[PDB]
Amino acid sequence: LLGQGDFIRHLMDLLKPELVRPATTLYQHNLTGILETAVRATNAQFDSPEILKRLDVRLLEVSPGDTGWDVFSLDYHVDGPIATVFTRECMSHYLRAFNFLWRAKRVEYILTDIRKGHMCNARLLRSMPEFSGVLHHCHILASEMVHFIHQMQYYVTFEVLECSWDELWNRVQRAQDLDHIIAAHEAFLGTVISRCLLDSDSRALLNQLRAVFDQIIELQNTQDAIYRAALEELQRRLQFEEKKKQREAEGQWGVSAAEEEQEKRRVQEFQESIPKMCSQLRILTHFYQGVVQQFLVSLTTSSDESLRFLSFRLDFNEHYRA
């Protein structure tokens, strides 16, 4: 249930270099070593070795030849009189929920990395305010979406985790005998995520959820485009200074400045790309707004007053409502 955090954080940290590779190019041989070395790295090493041996990483076919982010999975095999329950039917739901939360956490870390990149780059674009304006709009839309995803994911985390664990614990603790233990435990644990969190409506909303997730990848691509643009301006400045060297190159710097009289055409070209970048950012911003509002209306009309309350947490100060 991703309670560890640092375990999962470092897990996806190490999986980033791998799951980027095509699913075909992967090897569970190295994946198991990654798993075990991460567990030895994290606090899970301080827990019981029996549960540790109960864990296991698997390569769960999800995409034919796509990134390995999709096909990675954990199995946590438990068999025999040990956990006779779950009938290998509840563990399927557990695996599905694991995939769901895995995608959610991955896109969260994506957002965090993008904001880290923004903060790193900002101290480098303070000499070029023309790119600063578009970085302003970029950051504003990025923060918008990042706050929205953070809020929704934290809300669902609190809801699902608290309800599930609290009810299971209390019911099993209060249940006098095994028949009730097994029945109530398994039924509640299955029902919380099977139907309450999954239905035709659930997948319909998951549609726009994954849409805005890919919006995240799109914005990362735009970020890297602007980052290569920033590198281009940086190298422009660097060659400026390197050819100048304060007139100790003298004739070299003279001809360098004579040429950069022409190269200022390149600065003007970047300036002209600036409105192109602004337009392509604004169009993505508008599409993200539209899909967000469609998702909001959809879920608000759909069901589960709790998630509507989460939405009002999201829509605090009334920016939605068409």
């Binding site: 640092d6 790193c120 101290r123 504003i140 609290d166 100060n317 920016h319």
Partner: protein
């Protein structure tokens, strides 16, 4: 990997408060004053591999370094029985006398002189760890020594390692009184400009409201710097509490700061903590009291005609609570409309549930620490800027900055700092309005 944070104790006050913080951490983790594990320190769940590095003999040696331009405070800290907590490699003895005279220029120049004598230590402490989340710098902007030293070191670290979280604990001098160092506002302004240029998330620490709470909420006729440091160390150590619970959420400082900061220039966060004492409470009481302008440690000026929007509101709640309580408390506060948000980018009031350490003696059910990105602090900045402006109008005590030729050659550094601060304040003013997208 568990990212660490390196502590930078600067100036007399910064070193004092850093020691207070480190002792608070030691108390929380339940370790001996020597840094050896206890029978009630390692059997819990608190992750002590975030601020202390585990040794080969169960020594959680702090990830902190002691720097000063006068060795007397260093000797006093050594006299503490918590000198055994730290390694001597973790400690640098001042080779300067009398600090820097509480001058920004003097501290900056001396930090320039000790460039590598600190760089070696910092690189050793860095490469001794696998991965670092960032830096934490305890300092006092009032002390010109630490102010200049911190400005120099922030410049150096930002240049050399542009890959860590830059956090500083900036002691804001009292606005309740004027100190003998009348050039203190310029020093602070220079430091503030550095923060604007360098820092990424500022937890403001005003001494005026600290004095106020001490007189009222600690009930002392004349608060002492030591008890103030004690209380502030307590309140600030409460912050990292979520970082010590790896059971709910990723809860990484980089992400937590990023969840609220809109711009690397607008990176200034308020403080406010409950309970304050020298009984019975529910969730709704927590934020209900936090909304009151009585438990804030950051004060503003006399402004009441300019609306101020809480840009971001977050609260860490340490104690045993129920999810229904939080779910209803949020909705209830929102419906009561005790807060505001930017109209164009409207946000919500984030909550962080966490549970108390068993080795922390608990006498209360809940404990709340607020983190607010808000506009009132501009007034304080204005309070400083005006204090600067009139001083710059008086052109007094500039011989202090003519001692160091860097400022004797030109005082334009002060002018640029003032301009940057004014730009930031106008940025805040614009953020108060929906047109901020255009700005």
């Amino acid at each position: 990997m568990p990212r660490e944070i390196i502590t930078l104790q600067l100036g007399q006050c910064g070193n004092q408060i850093g020691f207070e913080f480190w002792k608070q951490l030691c108390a929380e983790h339940g370790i001996s004053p020597e840094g050896i594990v206890e029978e009630f320190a390692t059997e819990g769940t608190d992750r002590k591999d975030v601020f202390f590095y585990q040794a080969d003999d169960e020594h959680y040696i702090p990830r902190a370094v002691l720097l000063d331009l006068e060795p007397r405070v260093i000797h006093s800290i050594l006299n503490s029985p918590y000198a055994k907590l730290y390694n001597p490699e973790n400690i640098y003895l001042s080779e300067h006398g009398g600090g820097a005279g509480n001058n920004w220029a003097s501290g900056f120049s001396q930090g320039e002189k000790i460039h590598e004598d600190i760089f070696d230590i910092i690189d050793r402490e860095a490469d001794g760890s696998d991965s670092l989340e960032g830096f934490v710098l305890c300092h006092s902007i009032a002390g010109g020594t630490g102010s200049g030293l911190g400005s120099y070191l922030l410049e150096r670290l930002n240049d050399r390692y542009p890959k860590k979280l830059v956090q500083t604990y900036s002691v804001f001098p009292n606005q309740d009184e004027m100190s003998d160092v009348v050039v203190q506002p310029y020093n602070s302004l220079l430091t503030l400009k550095r923060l604007t240029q360098n820092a990424d998330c500022v937890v403001v620490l005003d001494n005026t409201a600290l004095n106020r709470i001490a007189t009222d909420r600690l009930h002392i006729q004349n608060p002492s710097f030591s008890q103030i440091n004690q209380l502030v160390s307590t309140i600030m150590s409460a912050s990292t509490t979520t970082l010590r619970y790896p059971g709910y959420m990723n809860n990484d400082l980089i992400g937590l700061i990023a969840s609220l900061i809109p711009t690397p220039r607008l990176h200034f966060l308020m403080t406010g903590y409950t309970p304050l004492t020298t009984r019975k409470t529910t969730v709704l009481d927590v934020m209900r009291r936090l909304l009151q302008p009585k438990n804030v440690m950051v004060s503003t000026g006399r402004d009441r005609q300019t609306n101020h929007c809480y840009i971001a509101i977050l609260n860490i709640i340490q104690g045993e609570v129920d999810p229904t309580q939080v779910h209803k408390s949020l909705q209830r506060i929102r419906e009561r409309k005790l807060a505001n948000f930017i109209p164009w980018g409207p946000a919500s009031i984030q909550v962080a549930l966490s549970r108390k350490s068993p080795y922390l003696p608990s006498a209360h059910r809940v404990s709340g620490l607020m983190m607010a990105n808000h506009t009132s602090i501009s007034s304080l900045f204005e309070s400083s800027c005006q204090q600067y402006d009139k001083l710059r109008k008086r052109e007094a005590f500039l011989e202090q900055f003519r001692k160091e030729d860097i400022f004797k050659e030109n005082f334009d550094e002060l002018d640029r700092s003032r301009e940057v601060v004014q730009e930031l304040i106008d940025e805040y003013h614009a953020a108060t309005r929906p047109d901020y997208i255009s700005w």
